[model samples]
Each structure stands twice: as C-alpha cells, then as structure tokens.
Target chain A: SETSASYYQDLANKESANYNNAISQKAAIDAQISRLETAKTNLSTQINNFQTDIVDKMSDIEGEDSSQFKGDRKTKYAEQYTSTKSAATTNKTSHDTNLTSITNKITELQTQSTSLQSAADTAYSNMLSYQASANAAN
Target chain B: MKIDMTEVNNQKTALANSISNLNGQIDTAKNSLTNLTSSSSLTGDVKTAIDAKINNYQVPLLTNFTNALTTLSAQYDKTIEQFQSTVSENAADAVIDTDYLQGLLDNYSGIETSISTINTETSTIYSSISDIISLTNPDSSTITTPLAAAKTILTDTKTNMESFNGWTRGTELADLLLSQTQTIETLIGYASSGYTAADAKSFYNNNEFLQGVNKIAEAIAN
Candidate 1:
C-alpha cells in the first residue's frame, strides 16, 4: 500500500484548520488590543484633563474664589467634579485591567503563532527533501 | 503476478524515511512553540509597518498554511502507523520488477490525459521525461524523447521534485540509474535542485518567521 502526496496533504490540511484557529485567536487579540489602547488613549486623556479642571474648580469653590463668583459656577463645578472624577477614575481603571488581560492573551497567542510558523517552514523543508529523494529515485 | 518487492521496498523505504523524519518534524515542531506568551513590542512606526504589511488576506492565508502543518501531524500519525506496520523489517533485494515500465507509461499516459487539470504544456514533456527516467523505457511514450526532453522537465521542476520520489516506475529504472550510467547522474544531478539543509536555513532566514522577530526587535529598540 502507498500514500499520495495529496494524501499527505490531508495531514497538512487537517493541522492547518486548528493551526489557523490558533493564529486567528492571536491575531484577533492583537486587533483587540490595538482598539483597547486607542480607547485608553482618548478616554484617559480626557479623564486627566477633566480631573485637573475639577481640582481647579473645587479650589475656587472652597478658596477665596468661593461664593462670590457667578450663580452655580462654584457650587455646580465643585459638586460635578467630585462625582465625575470618581466615575472617570473607575472607568480608566477598568480599561487598564481589560487591556492587561488582552495583551497577555496576545503574548501567548503570538508565541504560539510564531511557533506554528516555524513548523510551517519545516513543511516546505520536508517538501524540499521529498523532492531531493524523489529526484534520486528518478 | 509477482508483486515487485522493490516497489514494496521503495515505497516502504520512502515511507520509513518520512515516518522517521516525521518524528523529527514533530520534535522540531514542538520546539517551535516556545515562550507561548509573546507580545509584539509594538507601539509605533514599526507597528504601523506591521499593520501596513498585514491585510485581511495575508493573515488568513498564513493561518491556513499553519493549519495545514499542524493538522497534518494527527492525520499522518495514523498513516505512518499503517506504513510502519507493513514495514519491510529486512526487505530483500527487489527483483526484475517488470511492471516498472507500466508505471513509467502512467506518468505520460496520465500526463497525456491531463494538459490542464494540472501541470503545463511543458509539464507533459517534463512528466514524459520524468516517466522516462523513472521507467527508462522509450515505450513509455512518444510524447517526448527520453534524455533531451527529460532535461528540460528536470531543469524546470528540480526545485521541488517531491512528486518524483514515489514515482510509479520502480527498481529496473532504479537499477539502471544506479549503474555507471549517464541518465542516472543526470537525473540525480539535475534533480538535486542544488537545495540542501543550508538552503533551507537561508530560506528560513529570509522568510517572515525570523524576519518578523528581528523586525520587531528592531522596531521596539528604535
């Protein structure tokens, strides 16, 4: 009994499906991380900027600038800053936590991906050897 | 009909080599996956370059190739098992193996039949020539003359002659080729494709696997 090259391809074919899923998982995670980082940048940036504004406004409400300014300027800014600052802090932390996990997954996925890639090279290597031997047979 | 023991042996030999080599492949494959938790130290221009180099098409195509190699192991394991069980533990010397000529014709006959399902206009010629070398029988066909026609085919397809390895034509072709023969050297020499482990190394070095790692290192460092 004998096996055909195409038949051997079946092995290649089967391995490829999962090897594919692995790469896909890694790739998808990378893309996910990219999006996460992007969101982190913009939202985190806004949070910092607003946090500074909140501190300034609170100082105005409680400092010499308190009460004398405009209508709700001191009181509203002061109160709004407290609650918004807290929310922003929590949101940013969540974003950070989420990114941490995603990247870790990416690391493993990428490691495995690179690993699979090396084996793929081996396939062609085997192909070349098969060619050499077959050539000898001829 | 006396089965050509050499055919059995040749097939057995090729399979045995593949089976032995298969373990190496498995072991080597295992080595590939080290430090699984790897992340691209990407956050800048090189990151951009990676994104630039990558497209939806490239990613999937690559994954597909990977999948082929990974899955092949399981599929091949069973086949290799079967091939091993039937192994010629102490294969005797293969006899006249007359049917060799018939296999020689099959390549051409198979070739003559398919001008486009695969191969090329030259493919038939090369196939005829491959058939000629493997079978060494002019009667294999008039589609192409033996040596000269074979020369062109060999030149073109030498780089990846895996197709020729388990070629249908068996021992008589091998026996004659093994002799102090012109065609024999020509076949081996041309079929050599001049590719070896070193060549494979060079190829791996240039290919993306390593280039990606190096590129990432450079990208992050920069």
Candidate 2:
C-alpha cells in the first residue's frame, strides 16, 4: 500500500535534493582545489627562486675571494636549509592530502548523483502506477 | 619539550634572512680587502693578515651556500620537466612547435650577451678546422663570419618580432632575463658547439636575407 505514487514521489524529492546539491558541491570544491594547487605551485617556485639568488651571491663570493668564510656558516645554514625544506615538503604533503580528501568527497557525490536518476525514474513509474490503482478502485 | 612551532618557524626564517644577509657581509669584507689591496700605503704583513682573515671566514660559507642552491635548481628543472611532459601527454590540444619561434621571441635582449662566451674551452672543433684557407690571418671572412651570422639571425628574429604588437618599451628589461639567457644560448648553439667561426657561420646562416639586407644597409649608408 505504501508503494503507491505518493510513496515514490516523496522518495523522488529526497533523492533529487542529494543529486542537485552533489553537483553543486562538486563544482565549488573543484574550483577551490584548482586554486589551491596554483597557490602551492607559486609558493614552491618562489622559495626555489629565493634559494637560487642566494646561491648566486654566495657562489660569487666563493669564487672571487677564495676565502674560508663559507666554512663558518656551513652547518648552521645546512640545518636551517633543512628546516625550510621540511616545511615546504610538509605543505606539499598537506596539499596532496587536501586534494585526496576533496577527491573522495567528489567520488561520493558522483555515487549519490547516480542514485538520484534511479529515484526519479521510480517516481515517474509509480506515479503512473498510482493512476492505474485509482482507476481500478473507480 | 612542548613543540613551539613559533620558535621553529622563526629559526627557519632567521636562517634564510641571515643566509641572504651573507651577500652583504661578504661584500663588505671584499670591499675592505679591495680597498686595502689597492692603496699603496698598506704594508705586506697587514695585507697578509686581512687576506688570511677573509679566506678564513668567507671561503667555506660560499661552499655551504651552493648546496641549497644547486639542489633547488636541479629539483626545479626536474619537476618542471615532469610537469611539462605530463601536460603534453594529457592535453587535448596539438603539440605546439613554438620552441624555435619562442627562442627567437624570447631574445628581445640586446643581441646578445650569450654570444660572447664562445671560447677555446667550451668548443673543440671551434678552435681547429679543415679547409678554410690559412685561416688565422689571411681571411677576414673567418673572423667576421660568426658575427655576420649572429647579426642576420638577430635581425630576422627582430623583424619577425616587429609584426607582433607586444614588443614595446617597458619595464621588462629587468623583469625578464633567464628566458632571454636561454633564448640567446639556443641562438648561439652552433657557435658554442666547438665549431670554428666559419663553420658556425655556415651552420647558423639560415637567414635568406643576410646578404640582401647588408647591401641594403650599405646602400642606405650612401
């Protein structure tokens, strides 16, 4: 009795909401993740450039002077260099991890949206079924 | 200990800042050393002491700095190459053969600082050659060949670039440099490839209007 047109139509509204919102949700995060990737690329590039310019200046001094000043800063600079490298590497990790999370959400949205199509079909089919049931009653 | 990220972050930032500041530090030391060396009044012992001190503090610092820089450059190139190949493979668009055009387009710099680097060490066949006459003294053609070839390429590229409205007087002379360097390097490839000047000219003399434009300039000079 509950499998009448009323039941499927109600079910259609519930599934349709999930489908429409999943499409909207997928779209917003896709753009957001794209921007985030751009940001990561820019940041890493900037850091690399900064490190390069420093290399140029330091290497030039090494060449011109032949001095041992480079010795004094070796361990200190190496440690700090490693620290920054680790920091940047972690950001890359976080970036990929964020994409992974967003990707999982999108995959779920796809599944949810696919299910909505079935829901709507059932709605229309049962709506006709309700019409037949009413006619038989008449 | 409780992990104080602020301390760790500050330490990192301070390291980068202080490392950059080494440029100034080394400069000041060099400037002082230079002033002492140039002035006739400084005694030999005094010069020696300053030299020793400079070497003691400056030499290894530079050695240390190269590690961070060299690693970055390698990774930068490697990552970009990987990304480029990935893009090329996945892209729906046709592969663009814009490298030659891009090489010419990028050399908007004065033509060119890169060409000056053709020396004995960088080239093998460049210094020695076969069948170009008694090359060193007899022929002006050998000396001027590379220049003429370079000039024609530069001119043709410039002419082609002229058609594009993007070339205008602007602030990019400072803003743009590496692409320009690589661009010139590509243009100067034959000359740098251990080929003799005449051979480099022959290799690079792809411009159809080379002799024509020269005669035109000569005529315009008249």
Candidate 3:
C-alpha cells in the first residue's frame, strides 16, 4: 500500500514539472509580441510626424506668399513647396512597409504559443488521472 | 507447522524499509516539481509586466503623434485662409499702387522659408521617437515560440512525475509537496529582475499549493 502511494506521488511531481515548463515558454512568447508591437507603433509615429511636417511647411509657404515680396521671391516659395511635398510622400511609403512586417511576425508567434499551451494542459490532465488510478489501487 | 517468528520479523522490516525509501523518493520528486512550477510562475509574471509596460509606453506615444497631426492640420487650414485673404488684399492694393504690392511679395517670401524649416524639425523629431518605441516592444510572434517551448517542458515534467506510483496519498507527502512549491515560487520571484523582491517575499509568505495550481491555470488561460 505504501509503495502504491509513493508511485502516485511521483506521478504528481512529474505532472507539475510539465505544467511549469509550459508556463515559462509562454512567457517568452509574450515578450516577443511586446517587442513587435513596440516596433510597429514607432514606425507609425514616424510616418505621422512626416505628414505633419509637410503640412507645416506648406502652411508657412502660404503665409509668406501673402506678405509683401520682391522680384523672384514668389518663384522661390513655390519651389520649396514642391520639394517638401515630395519628401512627405516618400516617408509615408516607408512607414507603411515597416508596419506590415511587424504585424505579420506577431501573428505567427501567437499561433505557436497557443499550440504549446494546449499540450501543457493535456499533460496536466493526464497526471491527475494517473494519480486517481493509484489512489484506487491502494 | 513450526512458527518462524524470525522470518516474520525480517519480512516486516524489509517492507518498512521499502516504504521509507519510497517516501524519501516521493519527497525528492515533489521538491523538484515545486521548484519547476514556481519558476514557471515567476517567468509568467515577469512577461506579463513587460507586456503591460510596453502597452503603457505605446499608448501615450501614439496619442502624442495624433495630437501633433491634428495641430498641423489646423495650422494648414489657418494658413490657407490667411493666404487667400492676403492675395485678395494684394490684388486690390496692386491696382492702386504697384510698389506696395511688390513690398508684400518680398515679405511673404521670407515667411515661407521660416515655415519650411519649422516643418522639417517637427518631422524629424516624430520619426525618431517612433523608431525608438517600435524597437523596444517585443515581437509578438517570436515570443509565442519560446512560450510554447516553456509550456511543453512543464507538461513533460508533470507527466513524468505522475508516472511514478508511490507516496500518492500521505498527508506528509502533501505537506512536503506544498512546502516545495512554496520554496520554488519564492525563488523564482526572487530570481527575476522584473518583479520587486518585496512582492515575491509577500507572495511566498502566503503560499499555498492551491495558489501554485492557480498560477498554472492562469498561464493556460492566457
């Protein structure tokens, strides 16, 4: 009877270990997701800033155009506007690309973490069942 | 049949020894399990904290960016309105005095260059801050792989412990298991830099096997 009891105890120990490992693995996965999310946010912010800069520049040009100007000044203000607009367009395109990459990576990792959690749960259930059997034998 | 008291005694002694050995083995197993389980819990807690921090940092940053956009948009609208007014005034004034119109054009050109520089500076700052935040947040998908691995290990350890058929029901064994679990939880919390030592100590002081079990459940729930 004592031997039977010891056997069940051992089984419980093993089950606990299996569950612990699973939890640790899950934590690591969460860290990865955090990293990716941070990246995405940063890129999005950069793009927003670029767009804002273009707006500010164009506004400034408009303000200047209203004030008194001399020879060739009007032509110069128009030229600056064209250049700033071009830079804004380029920034938008780059930020969009970075955001897409970060999103894809996060999705892949989440899927893998889900599968691992399932396996850990199954093992925990099995251990409980085995312990029950041992108790009955006694 | 002659009674053999000596043989009977020997049998009893052997049985007792086997029982004692099994008990010891069970205790050892329990300790190992507890350590693993607690470590797993600590890891989970740290991960949770880190994720929360990332979110905290991101939300404000995004909000700031959004506000900046709104401000710039308003400025654009205002500038457009001002430009139209200025043009209308200049056109009317030009007909009356050509020199006044030329002077307005000169002043307008100067204002335009200054606005261009201001726009450039704002754009630069926003892009840099955004890059920093993105680099800091952990990639979600990559994190999932390690998390899965950790879960697998915990599951395997649990399975192996259960396969052994000894010391399953003794109160002493349960106490031992519970004690070991407590130690593990404490150690794990201590080892992690993510959590304060005080919190870990507090958790360990009130430790329960049920609590350990709950931790496992929470991880699974996530």
Q: Which stretches of candidate 2 lie over 4 Å from their true place?
A: A1-69, B1-222
Question: Least lDDT summed over 10 consecutive residues: which range in candidate 3 chain B?
Answer: B88-97
- For candidate 1, give the docking quality class from DockQ: incorrect
- Against the native complex, each candidate's DockQ, computed on alpha carbons, is 0.00, 0.01, 0.01
Error of 2 at A10 (Å): 12
True contacts kept of 3: 0.02
lDDT string, candidate 3, B1-222, tens digits: 111223434654575566566556555655554454445454665544433332332222232333333333344344334433433222211111233333333444443443344345434433454533342322222322332343333233233323321223224334434544555565565666534345643443342544444443354356
lDDT of 3 by residue, A3-56 (tens): 887888788778878888887888888777776666556556655654564334
| Comparison by TM-score, 2 against 3, better one | 3
- Kindly report which residue stretches of model 3 are placed more than 4 angstroms away from their true locations once superposed: A1-14, A34-46, A62-83, A134-138, B1-222
lDDT (10s digit) by residue, model 1, range B81-118: 44333322122332221133233223443333331221
lDDT of 3 at A64: 45
Candidate 2 per-residue lDDT over residues B15-125, each given as its tens digit: 656656765665566576556545678566445444433343233233323333333334434433443343222222212222332343344232222222222211222
